[PDB]
Write a protein that binds this ligand. Structure first.
Ligand SMILES: O=C(NC[C@]12C[C@H]3C[C@H](C[C@H](C3)C1)C2)c1cc(CCCNCCCO)ccc1Cl
Ligand SMILES: O=C(NC[C@]12C[C@H]3C[C@H](C[C@H](C3)C1)C2)c1cc(CCCNCCCO)ccc1Cl
Ligand SMILES: O=C(NC[C@]12C[C@H]3C[C@H](C[C@H](C3)C1)C2)c1cc(CCCNCCCO)ccc1Cl
Ligand SMILES: Nc1nc2c(ncn2[C@@H]2O[C@H](COP(=O)(O)OP(=O)(O)O)[C@@H](O)[C@H]2O)c(=O)[nH]1
Ligand SMILES: Nc1nc2c(ncn2[C@@H]2O[C@H](COP(=O)(O)OP(=O)(O)O)[C@@H](O)[C@H]2O)c(=O)[nH]1
Ligand SMILES: Nc1nc2c(ncn2[C@@H]2O[C@H](COP(=O)(O)OP(=O)(O)O)[C@@H](O)[C@H]2O)c(=O)[nH]1
Ligand SMILES: *[C@@H]1O[C@H](CO)[C@@H](O)[C@H](O)[C@H]1NC(C)=O
Ligand SMILES: *[C@@H]1O[C@H](CO)[C@@H](O)[C@H](O)[C@H]1NC(C)=O
Ligand SMILES: *[C@@H]1O[C@H](CO)[C@@H](O)[C@H](O)[C@H]1NC(C)=O
Ligand SMILES: *[C@@H]1O[C@H](CO)[C@@H](O)[C@H](O)[C@H]1NC(C)=O
Ligand SMILES: *[C@@H]1O[C@H](CO)[C@@H](O)[C@H](O)[C@H]1NC(C)=O
Ligand SMILES: *[C@@H]1O[C@H](CO)[C@@H](O)[C@H](O)[C@H]1NC(C)=O
Ligand code: NA
Ligand SMILES: [Zn+2]
Ligand SMILES: [Zn+2]
Ligand SMILES: [Zn+2]
Ligand SMILES: [Zn+2]
Ligand SMILES: [Zn+2]
Ligand SMILES: [Zn+2]
Lengths: 552, 552, 552
C-alpha cells in the first residue's frame, strides 16, 4: 500500500497552437490581475484595520462686551460666565439667557405663551400638571396683566416659562470666540498613539479649510460659516454643532500617514416644530434664602453645544489578510480557460455549419473548433445491460439501442444514430425482418430471442457475408489462429475448446471491423446471418449457444 | 519564441453518459448555489458596512408634587430642581436626597452607620482617614447621642455620611416623568445622515413596544416596567438604566430602510455588595459664609442615570465586496467533480468485486466504474535505470522488477506483477535458472551479467522460440526489412549496419509482442534463448554485444 | 436534448509513479493545510466579531488633610470638595486651585504674567480684548504694585489671571485616593452582557499588575507610577490620564473567556507649549451680591481628568464566516500541482540536455520529465488554409509551412521543422526545383501552381518512387481495394468513380506513411513525382485534377 501513497496525478492536456486563443488567454489574465491588484491597493486589503479610541480636550478663549440694563450698563462675559466645566467630547457656549430672580413657590398666573390665554375658569383645570408652564393649575382664571388673563398655577413664582428668547442674542459676540481642540487617539491593537498637535505648530494660527487645514484653533463663527449656517440667528435659540475629526491613518512605515481631517455639521434640526423644543437650552437653578423664605433664581441658558465627533481607522500590513484576499481572488484566473473552452464547445456544434455559417460567413473560420473538440473530449456511454450497437451494411453510421426488447425484434426497434470512428488508417496500412436471405431463426429462449432477430441490412440486398473481406477476416481459420497465438504463443490447436475460441475471435473480429471502437464492439450485436455462418465454420459439438453476454 | 506565446492549454476530458452522475452533479451544483446565494442575501455580503456616529439630545418633562416637613409643607419639583445641565448621551433624574445644611469643618462624632458603634477609645485610631465617614479620626470615643458612642472625627460637621436614603423615595413620582430623545446619526463613508424624528410624527404619543414603537417620548416608569424593574424601589438608592437605540440601516435605494429600534437594559448590578456603593448617587456641595465662618450645604442626591446607547451599521452595495465574496465561494463548485471522481476511484478498486459485492449485491451495478477509471486514468512509471519488465510464457501477466541485481539472476529476483494491455484488436485484425533448454550463458561482464540471466519461463517446458509466431515476427528477415523500409523508404540492404538494424528491430518486435505497451517494451528484458536465436540469425561480424541500454 | 443534460465531464489524467513527486505533493499539501489551520485558529476567522457597548460608573474614595492659611489653618477635603458630579467615562479630581474672591466688574491692572510688564501707555491698546487677562484694555499703563506697571483692563477685578499654580500642589495628597470603576459591557448582536465585578471578589483589594490584575479599585498614585509618571508634579498644573479597559472576549461555550485588561496611558502632552494651555484646569464662578453690588468668586481648579477608555470585541462561532474563509483558502491546495507541472514543463525542454546537463551532472536524472511531458501534453496546430506539411526522403524530420505561396515554389519556401511521430510499432508489427528527375510541371492555374511545385527531396538523388514500399503501399491496386472494402464492404469495383477513390486512397496512404499522424497527413503535400505516378496508375478519363483541398 506504500506505493499507492507515492502517487502524483497530472492532467492530460492538449496544447493548442493558436494566435487568437493565446491572445485571449493573456488579455483575460492581465485583466484579472490588474483588477485584483487595483482592489488590493485602493482598499488596502493587505491591511488589518482597527478603530481608534479618542480623548478630547477643549479650551474656549474669548471675552464678550455687552450693554445690558432702564439704564445703560456695560459689562463683560468671560469663560466662567458662559461655559460649563465639561471640556471633553462636548462643550457648551452660552449665547442668550433669560433670568428669573427671587422665585417663590406659591400661586401665580402662567405666562401667556403662544396660546395660553384663558377666557374663563372653564378652560383651566384644577390639579392638572402643565409640563410647559411647569406648575399645577388651580382651575381659576386670573389676570396676568391689565389686558389678558391666564390660568393660575402653583409653581415657582413669578412664572416666566414660555417667554421668548431675547432678540438679538445677548452673547451673539461669541461668534468671535475661539476654541482650541486637543485630540489624543490610539490604536491599541497596533500599539500606536498620536495627537493632533505636533511640535513646531504655529500657535497664532486659526483654522482654514485651505490655508490652515491643520490648525486646531477654530473661530465659532467660521465653523458656522464654512457650512452656510448663521451664528447670529442660531444664537437666539441655540443649537448643536458637530465638529468632525476624521483619522484615516496608514501605519505602515513606508507609507506612514496619520493626520486628522476637520469637518463641520449642524446636528440639530433647523425646522424642528415649536412643540418639540427647537434650538438648545437648559434651565439652571441657584437656591438661596432671603426674608426668611426659600428662594430660587432660574437661568434659562440658550446657546450652542459643540459635539466633537472623532472617528477613523488605523491600517497596518497583516499577512493573514493578504493570504485570505489572494486566495479569495485565485479562482478568477480560471476565466480564460472557462471562456475559451466555452468557445470550443459552442463552435464544435453542427448547428453552426448548417444554419449560422450560411447566414454569416464571418464566423465560418471558427469551424476549427470541431478539430479542437475532437482532440479534447472523448464521449463514452454507461455500460448497462440494455446497451446494444447495431450496424447495417446499407447505412454509413452506427445505431445505439439502449432499451429493452419487449418481444420486438431488434431489427424493428429504433435507436440513436452514432458515428463510426476514424479506423486508425496507420494501423490499417426466411424470417420477415431479414432482408438478405441468409438469416435463420434464433435458437434462444423466447424471453431473450429478440436480441438475435437482427439482419445485416434494413433493406433487401446482398448479404455482407458475400464480401471476400468477411471470409478473410471472420471465417479465415489461419487468421484467427494467428491472433490466438499472438495472445497465447503456446496454445494447443486441438480439442473442442479451440472451436469456441475461434468462434469468439470471429465474433470479436466482425465487431471490431464493423464498429472500430472497442467500446461499441464490446456491446455490438452480430447479425443472424454472420453469426450462423461463423457457427457453421466453428460449430459446437455438444451444447447450446449462449449468445451475447453482458460484459459488466 | 512568438509561437510559444500564442498557445492555449485545454484539458482532455471523458464525457460520461450516466443518469446517476449527471443527477448528482446537478443536485450538488444547485445545493452549493442555493447556499451561497442565501449567505449573500441574509448576511448582505454584497454590502460594505459602516458604523454610525451619533449625537443625542434629551429633554425631561415633568413636575413632581411632594409633601416635605414637624409640619406639613407642600412643594413642587421642576426640571431645574432634579436634573443636571447635561442633556447628551446620559441624563440624571433625582429621585431621593439627603441634605446637610450649615456644615463647619470642626470635630464631631461620626454617624453610626451599620457597624461604626465604638465602645472605647481603643477602637478609634488618631490620624486615620476614613473614606466612609469622610473625616480624620482623633482616637477618642465620644457620645453621638444618649445611647451610642462613635469615634470623633475632624470633618465637615455635622457629619451625616452613612445615613440611609429616605424610604419611600421623596421624588418617586418621577416615574411619571417623560423624556424626549432626539437622535442624529450619520454614516460618513456612505455620506448618509438621518434622525429619529421625521416630519408628520405624532407629538402627543408615548413610546410603546407594539402600539408606538417609533415614538421617542418615554415615560420612565414604562422604561423600568418593560424589562421588569421597579422604579419605586430603585428610586430609594438610585441606579443606572440603559436606553439602547439600534440602527440597522440599509442604504440601497431599492431596499432603503434606516429606522431605530429602542430597547432598555438596567446597567447597574442589583445585587451589588453594600461596601461597593450600591445604586447611584453623588455628593454636591454649595458653599457660603455665615456668622463670619466658611459654611457648606451638602446634598447627597440619589437618582437614576439614564445612559443612551446608540449603535448600528449602515450597509450600501459595494462591487469589491461582491467580487471578493463570489471569488471566495467559486471553488465550492468543484464539489460535484470531487465527489463523483472519488466514487469512480473507489468503486474501480478490486476489493469490491471480491469482498463487498458478495456480501452486498445492491452495490454490484457500480462495477461500471472500472470502465470509467480505465477511460480516465493512464498509470505510468518513472523511467529509472533499475526499471525492468519480464514476461514468462507460462504466466498470463507481466512482472516489473524496479530493483538492482546484486549478482542474483533476474530469473530468481522477484518483482511486482502488472497486467498486460488490450493489444489493440483493431490493429491486429544448460544454465540452472533456465527451464527451456535453449538459453546460453551471458557474455557480458560479471558486474552486469545477471540482467541477461533470464529464461522464457519460470518452470520447465517448451521454449517460446518453438512457436511459429516467433519465427514469423522476430526471425523473419522479410518482415524486419519491410518495417525498416517503412521507417526508411530508401534504406540500403547491405553492409554490417543492416544486421545491427535487423537485430534491434527483432528485439523491439519481441518486446512489443510480449508487452504490447511501448512503455513496458522500452524497459522489457529479452530472455537469453530468444536473444541468442536473434543474434544467430543476425550476428555481429566483429565486436561485442552491448545488450540492454537505459533509454533515458 | 435531455441526454445532453445528463452528462458529466471528467478530466483525463496521467498518474505518475514517482517517489519525489508524491513526496513533494504531500509536503506542499501539509504545509498549506498547517498554515491555513494556524491562521484560522490564531485569528479566530471562524468567528464573527462584534464591538462592545459600555457603561462606566466611577466612585472616588478619600479625604485629604491640608494646612492652609498668616495663620496655620487645618482643614480637610472630602469628595464634594474635589470632584464634579459626573461619574461616567471621565472623572475629575482637583489637585490644586487658585481662588479669587469678591470680584467686581471694573477697571484694574492686569496681572504681570510672564511678559505683561508695560513701560508706557504706548504698549497698551484701548478697546483690545485680551483672552489671556480676560479683560478689555483701556490703553493706559498703571501701577500694579510699587515696582512694575501693567495695562489697565475692564474686567472682573481684582484680576489674577496668569498667576502661577501653587507649588507644591495643595491637594497633592490625592495620590492616596482610590477610585472604584464599575464597567458594564454588552455585545447586542451576540446577546451577551457582563460586568467587571463578579460575585466573590475581594472588596479590600487594590489593583496590581501582577498580584491583583482584576481588582477594579485603583490608587491614583499607583496609576501614575505604573507608567512612570509623577503624580506630585502633575498635580501642580494638572493633566489627563487614560485608564484603558480592554475586553478581548471569546463567547464560545467551549472556550468562554470574557475578562477585562486594565492599562494606563497619559493623554495630555507633557511638553505642551506655555501658550497652548499646558496641564488641565477650568475656571468655575460662584456669583453673589454683597454691599449692594454684583460680585463673583472665581475658582481656577487644577487637577487630573481621568478618561475611562473601554474597547474590545466579542467573538462567537459563525458558519458563514467559516465557509467564506475555507473557500478563500481552497485554491491554495493547487500549489503542488502548479509546482510539479512547472518542473515537468521546464525539465522537458531541450536546453537542459545540451547546456545545463554537461555543466551540472546532478540535475541530469531529471531527464525523465521528457517522458512525462510526452505523456501529458499533445501539441496540435490550428488548421488554416495556409497550413502545409512537406517531407523530404533525405531529411529525417517534417517541415511545416504555414504561409502563403506568393508565386514561389513550395520547394524553395522555408518552414518550421517539426518531429515525426513514433509510428505505433504495435500496429506495424526537368523542373529546376526537382532533384529526382521524375517530377512534372503542375497543371493547376498559375495562381495556385506553386503548391504542387514540390519534389521528394531537397538534394539530387534517387526518387522515393523507386522503393518497393512505394509500390506496395501506394500503387498496389489490391491493397487500396482492400482498404476501400474495409470501409465499404459492398463497394462496386467498376465505373470511373472507383479510380477516383483509389487515387484518393493512394494519396492518403502516402501521407500517412510519410507523416504518420493524421493531423499532419491531412495537411500534407504530396511531391509531384508521387502525385503523377499515382495519377498515371489511376488516371481521370475526363476532367481536370483539383489537387489539395482545404479540409476545413
Ligand atoms: O451665571 C452665569 N453664568 C454661568 C453659567 C453659564 C452657562 C454654563 C453654566 C450654567 C449656566 C449657563 C450659567 C454656567 C451668568 C453670569 C453673568 C455675569 C456677567 C454679566 N454681568 C456682569 C455685570 C455687568 O456689569 C450674567 C448672566 C449669567 Cl446667566
Ligand atoms: O438643589 C436642588 N436641586 C438641584 C440639583 C438636582 C440634582 C442635579 C443637580 C445636582 C443636585 C442634584 C442638586 C442639581 C434641590 C432643590 C429643592 C427645591 C424644591 C423643593 N423645595 C421647595 C420648597 C417647598 O415649598 C429641593 C432639594 C434639592 Cl436637592
Ligand atoms: O469649591 C470647592 N470645591 C468644589 C469644586 C471642586 C472641583 C470640582 C467642582 C468645581 C470646582 C472644582 C469646585 C466642584 C472648594 C472647597 C474648599 C473647602 C475645603 C477646604 N476649606 C475648609 C476650611 C478649612 O478649615 C476649598 C477649595 C475649593 Cl475650590
Ligand atoms: N459482441 C457480441 N458478442 C457475442 C455475440 N454473440 C456471442 N458473443 C460472445 O460469444 C460468447 C458466447 O459464445 P457462443 O458462440 O454464443 O456460444 P458458446 O461460447 O458455445 O457458449 C459470449 O461470451 C459473447 O460475449 C454478439 O452478437 N455480439
Ligand atoms: N528492450 C530490450 N532492448 C535490448 C535488449 N537487448 C538489447 N537491446 C537493445 O539492442 C541494442 C544493443 O544491441 P545488441 O544486439 O545487444 O549489440 P550491438 O547493437 O551490436 O551493440 C541496445 O540499443 C538495446 O536497447 C533487451 O533485452 N531488451
Ligand atoms: N493531403 C493531400 N491530399 C491531396 C493532395 N492532392 C490531392 N489530394 C486530395 O485528393 C482530392 C483531389 O483529387 P485529385 O486526384 O487531385 O483530382 P480529382 O479527385 O479527380 O478532382 C482532394 O480531396 C484532396 O484532398 C496532396 O498533395 N495532399
Ligand atoms: C467680531 O470682531 C470684529 C472685529 O472687527 C467686529 O467687527 C465684529 O463686530 C465682531 N462681532 C460681533 C458679533 O461683535
Ligand atoms: C444672520 O441672522 C441675523 C439675525 O440675528 C441677521 O440680521 C443677519 O442678516 C443674518 N445673516 C445673513 C448672512 O443672512
Ligand atoms: C402617576 O400618575 C398617575 C395618574 O393617575 C397617578 O395615579 C400615580 O399616583 C402617579 N404616580 C406617582 C408615583 O405619583
Ligand atoms: C415596588 O417597590 C415598592 C417599594 O418602594 C413596593 O411598595 C411595591 O410593591 C413594588 N412594586 C412591585 C410591583 O413589586
Ligand atoms: C500617602 O499615604 C502614606 C501612608 O503612610 C503617607 O506616608 C504619605 O505621606 C501619603 N502621601 C501624601 C502625598 O500625603
Ligand atoms: C515628583 O515631583 C516632585 C515635585 O512636586 C518632586 O519633589 C519629586 O522628587 C518627584 N518624584 C520623583 C520620583 O522624581
Ligand atoms: Na478559489
Ligand atoms: Zn438477413
Ligand atoms: Zn445477411
Ligand atoms: Zn531457457
Ligand atoms: Zn527459452
Ligand atoms: Zn523530383
Ligand atoms: Zn521524386
Amino acid at each position: 500500500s506504500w506505493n499507492d501513497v507515492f502517487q502524483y496525478e497530472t492532467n492530460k492536456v492538449t496544447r493548442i497552437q493558436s494566435v487568437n486563443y493565446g491572445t485571449i488567454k493573456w488579455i483575460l489574465h492581465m485583466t484579472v490581475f490588474s483588477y485584483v491588484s487595483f482592489a488590493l491597493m485602493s482598499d488596502k486589503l493587505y491591511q488589518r484595520k482597527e478603530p481608534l479610541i479618542s480623548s478630547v480636550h477643549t479650551k474656549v478663549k474669548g471675552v464678550a462686551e455687552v450693554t445690558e440694563n432702564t439704564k445703560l450698563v456695560h459689562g463683560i462675559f468671560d469663560t466662567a460666565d458662559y461655559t460649563l466645566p465639561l471640556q471633553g467630547n462636548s462643550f457648551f457656549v452660552m449665547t442668550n439667557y433669560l433670568k428669573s430672580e427671587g422665585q417663590e413657590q406659591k400661586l401665580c398666573p402662567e405666562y401667556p405663551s403662544r396660546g395660553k390665554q384663558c377666557h374663563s375658569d372653564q378652560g383651566c383645570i384644577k390639579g392638572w400638571m402643565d409640563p410647559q408652564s411647569k406648575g399645577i393649575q388651580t382651575g381659576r382664571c386670573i389676570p396676568y396683566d391689565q389686558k389678558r388673563k391666564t390660568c393660575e398655577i402653583f409653581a415657582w413664582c413669578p412664572a416666566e416659562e414660555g417667554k421668548e428668547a431675547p432678540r438679538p442674542a445677548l452673547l451673539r459676540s461669541a461668534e468671535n470666540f475661539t476654541v482650541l481642540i486637543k485630540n489624543n487617539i490610539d490604536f491599541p491593537g497596533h500599539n500606536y498613539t498620536t495627537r493632533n498637535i505636533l511640535p513646531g505648530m504655529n500657535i497664532s494660527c486659526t483654522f482654514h479649510k485651505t490655508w490652515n487645514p491643520q490648525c486646531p484653533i477654530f473661530r465659532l463663527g467660521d465653523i458656522f460659516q464654512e457650512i452656510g449656517e448663521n451664528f447670529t440667528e442660531v444664537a437666539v435659540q441655540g443649537g448643536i454643532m458637530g465638529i468632525e475629526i476624521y483619522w484615516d491613518c496608514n501605519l505602515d512605515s513606508w507609507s506612514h500617514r496619520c493626520q486628522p481631517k476637520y469637518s463641520f455639521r449642524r446636528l440639530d434640526d433647523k425646522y424642528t416644530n415649536e412643540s418639540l423644543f427647537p434650538g438648545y437650552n437648559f434651565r439652571y437653578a441657584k437656591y438661596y434664602k432671603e426674608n426668611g423664605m426659600e428662594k430660587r433664581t432660574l437661568i434659562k441658558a440658550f446657546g450652542v453645544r459643540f459635539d466633537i465627533l472623532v472617528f477613523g481607522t488605523g491600517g497596518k500590513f497583516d499577512i493573514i489578510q493578504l493570504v485570505v484576499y489572494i486566495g479569495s481572488t485565485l479562482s478568477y484566473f480560471g476565466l480564460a480557460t472557462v471562456c475559451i473552452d466555452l468557445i470550443i464547445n459552442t463552435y464544435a456544434s453542427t448547428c453552426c455549419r448548417s444554419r449560422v455559417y450560411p447566414s454569416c460567413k464571418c464566423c465560418e473560420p471558427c469551424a476549427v473548433n470541431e478539430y479542437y473538440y475532437r482532440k479534447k473530449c472523448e464521449p463514452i456511454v454507461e455500460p448497462k445491460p440494455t446497451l446494444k450497437y447495431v450496424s447495417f451494411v446499407d447505412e454509413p453510421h452506427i445505431w445505439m439501442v439502449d432499451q429493452q426488447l419487449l418481444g420486438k425484434s431488434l431489427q424493428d426497434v429504433k435507436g440513436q444514430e452514432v458515428p463510426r470512428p476514424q479506423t486508425d488508417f496507420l494501423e490499417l496500412s426466411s424470417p420477415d425482418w431479414c432482408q438478405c436471405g441468409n438469416c435463420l431463426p434464433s435458437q434462444l429462449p423466447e424471453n431473450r430471442r429478440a436480441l438475435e432477430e437482427l439482419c445485416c441490412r434494413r433493406k433487401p440486398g446482398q448479404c455482407i457475408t458475400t464480401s471476400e473481406l468477411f471470409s478473410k477476416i471472420v471465417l479465415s481459420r489461419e487468421a484467427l489462429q494467428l491472433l490466438l497465438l499472438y495472445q497465447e504463443p503456446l496454445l494447443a490447436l486441438e480439442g473442442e475448446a479451440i472451436n469456441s475460441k475461434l468462434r469468439h475471435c470471429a465474433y470479436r473480429s466482425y465487431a471490431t471491423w464493423r464498429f472500430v471502437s472497442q467500446d461499441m464492439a464490446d456491446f455490438a450485436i452480430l447479425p443472424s446471418c454472420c453469426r450462423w455462418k461463423i457457427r457453421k465454420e466453428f460449430p459446437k459439438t455438444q451444447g447450446q449457444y449462449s449468445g451475447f453476454k453482458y460484459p459488466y
